[PDB]
Design a protein around this ligand. Structure first.
Ligand SMILES: [Zn+2]
Lengths: 97, 16, 98, 645, 282
């Protein structure tokens, strides 16, 4: 069981999945939430692009990291004009005093 | 000369 | 968003959360059950113009933590509360009733 | 920023009151404004150093009171339409009250519910604790003020309207069911917030007056229908009105009253006139009134003592009909006619009770009692003749003369018989009579097959237990093993060292003593002809070799055999008994035999001697050598030289 | 400095008392309410109003500055007011004897008066003794005999006294084996955040936190494990050795018995397990 926190600029999504989860089901979850075609968005992990075919078994999103009390942070970027994608300019959260 | 050909006897049995 | 509610913090951050995850707090359940005759236009927006994003994030985190750990007998761990986040997150829990 | 801060009351309360007015009736309001007002209420409830929970509560209460008073005035000004306007404003206000209860959730859960801490519960004081004008939920308060300021001041006007419309429905008119139902269940909905006696307000305000008025109206209706209509269509309209009333009660009132009304809609128009019903039911059952029987059954099962009188009357009718059916039995076929008549009565009345009277258990019990009295109907100064008739019926069913009837219908008639046989009160007489005629049939071999009496005795055992047919059980087993004993004796005869042709085809029947209902002739000392003493002694030795401590007795008033005339020109087959064989042996010894040699040979008493001699003279077996028409002790006889048959 | 009034004749109807008085004792007087005059005196050190018919205490004190010892037993007071505990009376009050009065639910706000040293609440019908007398560090004498005290506060287990009078009170049998399950898992977010806030032991106030939350924090129960619990707890009324709290314990018709019922509050079932193990072992 893995808990993921997708962050795409002024948006954040909490998702549930499993270790054998493929990237395509996360991508179609983002489809159902953003109704923007899946080839536009591509997932990341610490400024590193990740591919659709593989599963989260070796992605590093283990149950010890993807946790209900600390979901694994996942980036996301849609498609800009043409076949280009915007950078990972997702803003951080506010700073508690 | 006349003779009996059949007989259907009936009997009861009890303690001696 | 007819099955994913959206929470807008004061800072402007948008959080997309399962409806049942958000319904563990009474006030969100009331807010959705608001004026009635809801559009069901694939849009569930609730704007918390009073709580910072860094607190509403932990609110959604606790929503998931409560919802998945319900009806479970495993070794449930203590929820992480930072000392720099305890106060306003606590009063956010008050406003949310969860 | 979520923070306890100084908050000005009026500025927030402006938009708060605006949206509360917007929500109190169904009209458009933004979801964003809804959440903003949640935030505003939270800010108002907690503030430093001046909390505004009490001020917010009081102002909301005042606004609700003003709104409900305005609604009450507007509805009162709406004459001739109080109910419809009341229901419209009621549904609007109830939905708005639920919306406010949701919307003041922080106020309810953090101020109102914290102020009910009157007793010592770890939180004494520290908020409103003194008992003065108790606080309650905003939805609860809204409904409470609805009942105090809209319901009670309008109470008397509502009922007069409501009772008018329901009566209007009972007069055939069709009012708007939605409005009446809403008004009626509004009393429950308002009071819904009390844990104990939720319907109490409804019971006091609408239920009891409705019960009384329905009672009066249906008392009047019953009095009328009794006045212009006779009994049959009276029950017809009772049923119609009761059905329509139950439909109406479901249509309007709360479910908890659905029974009460009909209970008060039958006691006023059925249970108050069962005297008219009980006095007439006697006529109905003794006549062909099926639907009427069903109508009284339905009416009387509802009331307390309606059934037992009809039950007793039906018992009496069935008993009288059965007596009438069995009082005119033709003598030539009296057993079978009696059995079929009782069967027909039972079948017809069970069909009537199951089909029309729904097969009530009490009706079946009354039928059983009536038919039990019928079957044991004994004429004055006479004994119960039913067991003899039943046993004779079984006999006649099992006799050879039952030509053209196979087995299957024989067991069918058997099962049909068993129902009537169950009604017999003294089974012992029938048991003795049937045992007697079964013994007669078995000795004479006058039964369809072994399985016929098997089924007979098995069903008798089923009806009256094993011990009832115990001797019956032994008799058929003994007659069945008779063939086994006969073949065993034949094997023994072939087994002896020297075998002599006796010239007699010997058949035996060895029977258990006591079980068989055949009496031994007291000291008849009949002298067996010498052709049979060898058989007697060999059978005695055979049995006492194969049995330990057992003796044998021989009765010769039933043993029969075949005597054939062969040497003469008149070959005739004769079935002849022991005494008649002795007579023929004596007449064969000497052509002239007088009575003295008859006593010398037979050596038995005179009664059976003379009975046998008339038996022979009946078919012209022997010639009486004298002219005397009576046989004295000196009479002479000879064999018939010229006999034909 | 010492005056005594045992009759209405000795009680001045209009004229005021002299300023040289130190101890004022008023008894056997028909005073339905406390007069505003006597609250204006400067140095009433010990004030006694026993055997009066006062049902409501004054809302606010006028000018008293010390009021070291106040006695109001044998009065007609039903229930104290909330506001009267917001004054500086906490600073110097040493005792409060309200025995044989109609006090049925004493306000918990009395904990704000941390400076008392002796309490006498005999012959009352108080439902239960207040919770945070653990805030009363300087208390020495407590007595609440002949009251309907079902269960003592948990803080009472850690108080240290000299003598205690509690006989004649309804004490139910301890039921460790049958807990009352008000605990819920997973913990409420409010409960968890309050747990963290108390664990960090950081200051707070009604200006920073909403007042109701502040109060829930103030009365938050401290579990036996050493970590507090606001809600979702296990409440168990258990018997405890009374001789540890007070070096002498007085009871009725009990020889060798020193048991006192205290409602222990437990953070979690897991923490409750170690105390169950201690109960079984000891
Ligand atoms: Zn603990």
């Amino acid at each position: 069981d893995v808990f993921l926190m997708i962050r795409h600029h002024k948006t954040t999504i909490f998702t549930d999945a499993k270790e054998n989860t493929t990237v395509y089901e996360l991508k179609r979850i983002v489809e159902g939430i953003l109704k923007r075609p899946p080839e536009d968005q591509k997932l990341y992990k610490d400024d590193q692009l990740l591919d659709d075919n593989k599963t989260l078994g070796d992605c590093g999103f283990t149950s010890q990291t993807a946790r209900p009390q600390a979901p694994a942070t996942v980036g996301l970027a849609f498609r800009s004009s043409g076949d280009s994608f915007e950078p990972l300019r997702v803003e951080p959260f506010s700073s508690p005093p | 000369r006349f003779e009996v050909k059949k007989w259907n006897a009936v009997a009861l049995w009890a303690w001696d | 968003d007819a099955m994913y509610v959206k929470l807008i913090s004061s800072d402007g951050h948008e959080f997309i959360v399962k409806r049942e995850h958000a319904l563990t707090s009474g006030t969100i359940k009331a807010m959705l059950s608001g004026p009635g005759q809801f559009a069901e236009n694939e849009t569930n927006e609730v704007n918390f113009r009073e709580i910072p994003s860094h607190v509403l994030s932990k609110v959604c985190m606790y929503f998931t933590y409560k919802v998945r750990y319900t009806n479970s007998s495993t070794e449930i761990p203590e929820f992480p509360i930072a000392p720099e986040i305890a106060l306003e997150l606590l009063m956010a829990a008050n406003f949310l009733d969860c | 920023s979520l923070k306890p801060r100084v908050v000005d009351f009026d500025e927030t309360w402006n938009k708060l009151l605006t949206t509360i007015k917007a929500v109190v009736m169904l009209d458009y309001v933004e979801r964003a404004t809804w959440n903003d007002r949640f935030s505003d209420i939270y800010a108002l409830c907690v503030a430093y150093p001046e909390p505004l929970g009490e001020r917010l509560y009081t102002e909301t209460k005042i606004f609700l009171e003003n709104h409900v008073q305005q609604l009450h005035t507007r509805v009162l000004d709406s004459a001739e339409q109080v109910l419809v306007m009341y229901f419209r404003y009621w549904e609007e206000y109830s939905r708005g009250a639920d919306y406010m209860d949701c919307l003041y959730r922080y106020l309810n859960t953090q101020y109102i519910k914290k102020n009910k801490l009157t007793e010592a519960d770890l939180q004494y004081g520290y908020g409103g604790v003194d008992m003065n004008e108790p606080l309650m939920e905003i939805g609860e308060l809204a409904l409470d003020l609805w009942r105090k300021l809209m319901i009670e001041p309008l109470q008397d006007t509502l009922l007069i309207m409501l009772l008018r419309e329901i009566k209007r429905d009972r007069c055939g008119e069709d009012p708007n069911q939605k409005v009446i139902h809403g008004v009626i269940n509004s009393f429950v909905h308002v009071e819904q917030y009390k844990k104990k006696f939720p319907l109490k307000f409804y019971q006091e305000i609408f239920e009891s007056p409705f019960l009384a008025e329905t009672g009066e109206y249906y008392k009047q209706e019953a009095s009328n229908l009794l006045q212009e209509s006779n009994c049959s269509q009276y029950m017809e309209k009772i049923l119609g009105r009761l059905k329509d009333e139950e439909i109406r009660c479901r249509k309007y009132l709360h479910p908890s009253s659905y029974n009460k009304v009909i209970h008060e809609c039958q006691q006023r128009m059925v249970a108050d006139h069962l005297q008219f019903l009980h006095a007439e039911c006697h006529n109905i059952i003794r006549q062909e009134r099926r639907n009427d029987m069903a109508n009284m059954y339905t009416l009387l099962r509802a009331v307390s003592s309606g059934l037992p009188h009809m039950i007793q009357e039906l018992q009496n009718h069935i008993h009288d009909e059965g007596l009438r059916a069995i009082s005119n039995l033709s003598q030539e076929n009296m057993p079978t006619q009696f059995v079929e008549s009782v069967l027909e009565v039972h079948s017809k009345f069970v069909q009537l009770v199951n089909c029309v009277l729904n097969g009530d258990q009490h009706f079946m019990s009354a039928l059983d009692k009536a038919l039990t009295c019928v079957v044991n109907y004994r004429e004055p100064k006479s004994v119960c003749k039913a067991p003899e008739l039943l046993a004779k019926y079984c006999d006649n069913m099992l006799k050879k003369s039952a030509k053209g009837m196979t087995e299957n219908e024989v067991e069918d008639k058997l099962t049909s018989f068993i129902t009537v046989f169950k009604y017999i009160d003294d089974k012992d007489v029938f048991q003795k009579f049937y045992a007697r005629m079964l013994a007669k049939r078995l000795i004479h071999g006058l039964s369809m097959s072994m399985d016929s009496e098997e089924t007979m005795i098995n069903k008798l055992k089923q009806a009256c237990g094993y011990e009832f047919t115990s001797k019956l059980h032994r008799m058929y087993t003994d007659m069945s093993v008779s063939a086994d004993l006969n073949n065993k004796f034949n094997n023994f005869i072939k087994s002896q060292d020297t075998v002599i042709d006796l010239g007699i085809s010997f058949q035996i029947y060895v029977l258990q003593a006591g079980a068989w209902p055949l009496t031994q002739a007291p000291s008849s000392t009949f002298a067996i002809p010498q052709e049979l003493e060898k058989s007697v002694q060999m059978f005695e030795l055979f049995y006492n070799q194969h049995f330990s401590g057992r003796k044998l007795t021989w009765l010769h008033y039933l043993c029969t055999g075949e005597v054939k005339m062969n040497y003469l020109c008149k070959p005739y087959v004769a079935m002849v008994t022991t005494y008649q064989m002795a007579v023929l042996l004596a007449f064969n010894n000497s052509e002239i035999i007088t009575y003295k040699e008859l006593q010398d040979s037979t050596q038995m008493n005179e009664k059976e001697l003379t009975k046998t001699i008339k038996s022979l003279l009946d078919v012209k077996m022997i010639n009486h050598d004298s002219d005397k028409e009576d046989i004295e002790g000196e009479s002479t006889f000879s064999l018939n030289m010229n006999f034909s048959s | 400095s010492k005056l005594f009034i045992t009759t209405k004749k000795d009680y001045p109807i209009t004229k005021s008392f002299p300023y040289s008085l130190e101890h004022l004792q008023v008894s056997y007087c028909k005073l339905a309410r406390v007069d505003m005059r006597m609250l204006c005196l400067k140095k009433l050190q010990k004030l006694d109003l026993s055997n009066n018919h006062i049902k409501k205490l004054p809302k606010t004190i006028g000018d008293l500055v010390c009021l070291q010892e106040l006695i109001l037993n044998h009065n007609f007071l039903e229930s104290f007011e909330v506001v009267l505990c917001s004054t500086t009376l906490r600073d110097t009050l040493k005792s409060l004897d309200l025995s044989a009065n109609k006090l049925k639910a004493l306000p918990v706000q009395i904990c704000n008066f941390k400076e008392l040293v002796s309490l006498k609440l005999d012959e009352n019908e108080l439902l239960q003794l207040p919770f945070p007398i653990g805030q009363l560090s300087k208390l020495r004498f407590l007595s609440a005999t002949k009251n309907n005290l079902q269960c003592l506060p948990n803080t009472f287990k850690k108080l240290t006294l000299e003598n205690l009078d509690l006989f004649g009170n309804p004490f139910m049998q301890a039921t460790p084996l049958v807990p009352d399950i008000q605990l819920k898992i997973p913990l409420p977010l409010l409960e968890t955040a309050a747990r963290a806030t108390l664990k960090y032991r950081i200051p707070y106030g009604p200006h920073l936190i909403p007042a109701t939350l502040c109060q829930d924090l103030s009365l938050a129960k401290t579990c036996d494990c050493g970590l507090p619990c606001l809600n979702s707890f296990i409440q168990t009324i258990v018997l405890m050795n009374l001789h540890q709290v007070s070096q002498t314990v007085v009871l009725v018709d009990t020889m060798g018995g020193t048991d006192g019922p205290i409602v222990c509050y437990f953070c979690s079932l897991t923490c409750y397990s170690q105390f169950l193990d201690k109960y079984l072992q000891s």
